[PDB]
């Protein structure tokens, strides 16, 4: 249970970051028409990540497999992989078979999908901060006002995706797994063992918001995430301009970006409305947690 938690549900940070990182580098750079789906590269990146996790190499590291279910015709603009069906597969021995059932690992895979797309978001944003530092304002001789504005626009969305990742992280992960460990200590019979892990996973999904009844918030997350990805890509697409006077023209697409910045802010405000809309109708404690995370300090962040 612990090793599966470490690797599939990504508790060990280093394994998750490295496995996501190599795949992301290839994903954004190219190889889009399923040339990143070659068995050799999939197996190689899996082995590389397992070796470089540094949490340890164990017999438990056996049975880990990287695979795919749906076949992408081609990766979409911005290489989103919003529903890329890359399935981590775990073999289970007959002792670990009455314990683990196929449906349970089908449920396991969902969080890997959603967590991975969160890492994908975090990647590109780390990279645009690293890109503005690639610029470095290396012509420090020229200090650009619009440069100053644009880093603030970046800070907005990186902190938003920081809060969402932190939200789900504090909702599930240590919270539900502590409960599950207590229940695991408590269970004393086959059926008891089955239901403890079953509700461990059902609680994890429910708090994860991937549950069908909580679809609206996840839809707003999709819209926000698509905006952040694409409009972060555009600044990378363009390049700076001659040094003189006020210089917005460095990466002249900034004007279109300001409209995008306003659209992202609109989704943010709408999300603050949505969470309260849903909490008042019914009883969803995770949503109360969410409505304070999204806005902690002022009427709106």
């Amino acid at each position: 249970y612990e090793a599966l938690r470490h690797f599939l549900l990504m508790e060990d940070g280093e394994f998750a970051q490295s496995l996501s990182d190599l795949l992301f580098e290839k994903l954004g750079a190219g190889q889009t028409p399923g040339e990143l789906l070659n068995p050799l590269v999939l197996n190689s990146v899996l082995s590389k990540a397992l070796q470089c996790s540094l949490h340890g190499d164990t017999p438990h590291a056996s049975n880990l497999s990287l695979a795919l279910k749906y076949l992408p015709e081609v990766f979409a603009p911005n290489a989103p992989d919003v529903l890329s069906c890359l399935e981590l597969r775990y073999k289970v021995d007959w002792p670990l078979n009455i314990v683990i059932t196929e449906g349970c690992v089908s449920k396991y895979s969902g969080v890997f999908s959603f967590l991975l797309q969160l890492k994908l978001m975090m990647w590109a944003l780390k990279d645009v901060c690293f890109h503005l530092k690639r610029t470095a304002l290396l012509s420090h001789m020229a200090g650009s006002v619009q440069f100053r504005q644009l880093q603030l626009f970046k800070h907005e969305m990186q902190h938003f995706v920081k809060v969402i990742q932190g939200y789900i992280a504090n909702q599930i992960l240590h919270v539900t797994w502590c409960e599950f460990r207590a229940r695991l200590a408590t269970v004393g019979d086959l059926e008891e063992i089955q239901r403890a892990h079953a509700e461990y996973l059902h609680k994890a999904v429910f708090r994860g918001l991937l549950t069908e009844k909580a679809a609206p918030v996840m839809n707003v997350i999709h819209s926000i995430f698509s905006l952040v990805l694409k409009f972060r890509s555009q600044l990378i697409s363009q390049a700076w301009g001659p040094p003189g006077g006020p210089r917005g023209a460095e990466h002249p697409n900034f004007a279109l970006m300001q409209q995008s910045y306003n659209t992202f802010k609109y989704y943010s405000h709408f999300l603050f409305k949505v969470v309260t809309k849903l909490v008042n109708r019914g009883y969803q404690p995770h949503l109360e947690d969410f409505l304070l995370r999204i806005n902690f300090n002022n009427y709106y962040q």
Partner: peptide, 30 residues
Amino acid sequence: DPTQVHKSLQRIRERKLANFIPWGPASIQV
């Protein structure tokens, strides 16, 4: 305790011990 960290952030919002109204929207994180 894992369940109490988010409630702690709830309760620190109740205390408002840290006063800040900056241009930045970045809230405190546990």
